[PDB]
Structures are given as C-alpha cells and as structure tokens.
C-alpha cells in the first residue's frame, strides 16, 4: 500500500503493522520489530546527515581599501562561494535523503509482506491489497503466532488443504 | 473467511517535504531544520553590555573625536554596533591607515 | 546554526501520509 492503496489512521502504535480479522473480531496491531529497526535506522540517518557539517571559526566579512579592490572581490567571492557550497550540499542531501527515506519505508513494507507470505504459502490465499484470506481458521493465538514469526504450517495444513481442495 | 492484512500508518499531518523526484510530498512525520524567525528580540548574548558608538565611526571612537565623549568609560562588550552613517568620524580630514586591520 | 540561502529545509523522518 506504499502506493497500492491507502494507510491506516486507526493504527497508532507504530509505523508498520497488521489488520487482523477473525471470528473473535478485527483490529490493528503494529509490528514492533520492523518499526523498531526503521526508527533506529532513520534516527542514525538524520543524526549522521546533520552532524556531518562542522565549519571552522570564521568572522565572515572583510572590507578592503581603495588600493585592495582585487583583494576585496576575492574575499566576497570566498564568502559567497562557501555560502553556495554549503547550500548546494544541504539542498541535494535533503532531496536525496527524503527520496531514500520514502524508498526505505517501501522496502520495509515489502519485507514484512514477504515474511507473512513465506509463513503461509498454501494455508492462505493472497488478497491483492496486501491481505491474506485463510483457507482455515486463524484464531487470536494463530494471529499472534503469525505476528511474532512462529506460525505453524503443518498445524493447519490438513484443514487448509481440505477447505482449499473443496473451495477449488 | 478470516483475513490478515498488512499496511502502514496514516495521520492528519500535512507536513510537506521536497524530493528530487517529487515536491510537496505530504509525510506523516518530519523535522524542520531551518529556523527562520529573527524575533523582535535583538539583545545581547551572554548578558554582556554590547556597546553602540551611536554617531561615531570606528576611527572617530578610537582617535578620540571630541563629540564622541559618550563613549569614554565604555570598557567591555560582547560586540560593537555602528551605524552605516555616523556623524562624528575623523573630523580633521584624513585617514587611519590599516583602519580595516 | 549555519547560515544558508534555502527557504525550507524540513527533512522527512516518516513515510508518506495517505488517509483512507
């Protein structure tokens, strides 16, 4: 849903998460592991990008007399050139790093989706909007096992094949 | 049948940032790095006594221009304020060599 | 802080906001 479809305003405990819907109802739940890694990385990124800019001690301006006009224009050029250089660096890195930040978030979405997919290959059928419909019943315990990386595929493989082969 | 879905977060934030591929990208969370509020507050820095020469040029203050006696005894500062157009400078016409040094 | 010529330097910490 990075651009596939929309986000979730009801999920307010993390960047990324799941929306589960079973017999016991529905609800949002953030994935703390991937959200935590993303916070770690974006924090280190912002701090590195900002803190990398340290400059030497400078009393900037200079005024040169009527016999030092060449001396003068050179100093104004140096001042304004350091201006241009630091401005150029800040602008480019802000643009590039906002790009890379959005793309990093997209890749985190993709990785979470692929994890949930690899856990449930034939026990669930993919719904095209980043969803899965179970051929079996995934109770709260099953949902949590999917969420903390410990889904049991042989546990439900029997019921899922039965319901799958009948559905199809 | 049951469904288990995956998605990311949304809020009511309208913070827009620019990327090279796309401008005015509304993000959920951002940080402004640019302070752009010269506040009416213009004061000293470390509670010092920043001294204004008033209508005296730097040369007029250093040489001792007679109309610049409001500056005598002004001993310490965090910086010095000079108008672009003071009235009392080098009164007898002349120059202070290396004025700028 | 550093003087620059930019008029806006807010950096994205989060991902795009897409309601609904």
């Amino acid at each position: 849903a990075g651009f596939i479809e929309g986000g979730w305003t009801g999920m307010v405990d993390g960047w990324y998460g799941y929306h589960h819907q079973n017999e016991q109802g529905s609800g949002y739940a953030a994935d703390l592991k991937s959200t935590q890694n993303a916070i770690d990385g974006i924090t280190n990124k912002v701090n590195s990008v900002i803190e990398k800019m340290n400059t030497q001690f400078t009393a900037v301006g200079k005024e040169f007399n009527h016999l030092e006009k060449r001396i003068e224009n050179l100093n104004k050029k140096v001042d304004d050139g350091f201006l241009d250089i630091w401005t150029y660096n800040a602008e480019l890195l802000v643009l590039l790093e906002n790009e890379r930040t959005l793309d990093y978030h997209d890749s985190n979405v993709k990785n979470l989706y692929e994890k949930v997919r690899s856990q449930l290959k034939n026990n669930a059928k993919e719904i095209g909007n980043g969803c899965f419909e179970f051929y079996h019943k995934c109770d709260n315990t099953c949902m949590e096992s999917v969420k903390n990386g410990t889904y049991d595929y042989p546990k439900y493989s029997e019921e899922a094949k039965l319901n799958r082969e009948e559905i199809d | 049948g049951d469904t288990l879905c995956i998605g990311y977060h949304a809020n009511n934030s309208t913070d827009t940032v620019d990327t090279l591929l796309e401008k005015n990208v509304t993000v959920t969370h951002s940080v402004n790095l640019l302070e752009d509020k010269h506040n009416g507050k213009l004061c000293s820095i470390n509670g010092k006594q920043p001294i204004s020469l008033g209508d005296c040029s730097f040369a007029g203050w250093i040489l001792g221009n007679p109309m610049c006696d409001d500056l005598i005894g002004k001993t310490s500062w965090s910086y010095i304020v000079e108008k672009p157009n003071p009235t009392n400078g080098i009164c007898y016409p002349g120059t202070l060599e290396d004025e700028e040094e | 802080p550093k003087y620059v010529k930019s008029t806006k330097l807010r950096l994205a910490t989060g991902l795009r906001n897409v309601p609904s």
Partner: antibody
Amino acid sequence: QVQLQESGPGLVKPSETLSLTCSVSGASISSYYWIWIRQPAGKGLEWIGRFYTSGSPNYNPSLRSRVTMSVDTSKNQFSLKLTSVTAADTAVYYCAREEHITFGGVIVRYWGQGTLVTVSS
Amino acid sequence: DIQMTQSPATLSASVGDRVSITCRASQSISSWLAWYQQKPGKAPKLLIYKASSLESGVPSRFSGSGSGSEFTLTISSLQPDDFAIYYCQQYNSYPWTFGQGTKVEIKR
C-alpha cells in the same frame, strides 16, 4: 488537557475479582491505547498492560492469566478486572494514556492520580 | 523478560551538585528508555524519552545519555524540587519494566 481519574473499591477479599475503572476526560478513548501500571508501596513500578478499542491487547506474563481489560466508549472509561487477587496483589494502581507514534517511539505523557488496592480479610 | 538494575538506591547531595543515576539493563534495548520522576505520593512525571529527548517543559538541567544496555540520568544542578524517586522504564520489548528506582535526597 487530557485528565485520567481512577476509581477502585479497595479492600478486595483474598479470592475475589478486582475491578478498577479509569475515567477519561478530554479525549475520545476509541482513538487511544490505554495502559495500566502498578507499584507495591515502596517497591518499584510494574507495567500491567495495554488495551485498545480497535486493536489487540497485550498483557504482562505474570498477570496475563488473570487480567482482562475492557473499554466503555459510552461512559469514556476503561476497566481492569483481575481474578483471584493475591496478597501480593496489594499495591497502588495507576492508569496512563498511550500517546501516538513519535520519532522517539510511543510516549505515555498522561498519568492517573493513583488508587490504593488492599487485599485483606 | 528484561530485568533492571538502577544504581544507586539512595542518594543525598547538596544543592547545585551534579547527580548521576545509572540504569543497567539485561539485554540490548538500543536507546529506548524513559526516565520518570515520581514525587512523594504523586503521579510519576516523564523526564526523558528516547533516553536523549528532554520532554518539553522539563528543566534543561536533566540529561539522558547512553545506548544499548547502559544509561545515565544526569542532573546538572540539583535543586530542592528535584527531591523524588527516579525510575527508568524500557519500551523496546514487552513486558515494559521499571527499575527499582533511585531516591534522590538533598544534603543541607
């Protein structure tokens, strides 16, 4: 402001069900997580757990088997219910609001005033 | 899961003295701690989150430093009103765990 007040009968009998109600003013509960935390007098603080109206609760393991958290959006409250309160369960209870996502992770800024629950015959 | 050693239990230091409270952790937690000031018989007041994010309105004398498993709450100038019990919470993994708390008193 968001303000969290706390009501607890106190003096729950040693094999009964504690029922605690945190009342919420200045915030629609349906769009916030709600947390319960506890303190055995001079002892440290303990996180009881988390609950949401459109979400999934998570509780502390030591109390997991016994805790149930509910939310009344009608009366703007949320309640703990702890089965078979032990002598060790006598402590001060606090209710807090789980703020939304921040760049420094999730914050609990807003805190209840604390009510004493004593377990005695 | 995450046991907490917050040293030392009891401190007394005169006004203006710097104070440092160490909050050792059982596992890796990155920098995800909180520091709370619980005044006597009152709700705990969150001093620091992110271990380095001074909550708005908190006096700038408070500073949180660390990442990983070791962390330190440092009061630059101890003041009378800073008499309380100081806890360190962890929000990297449930269950959230507090330290035993450190009682800061004042030599006078």
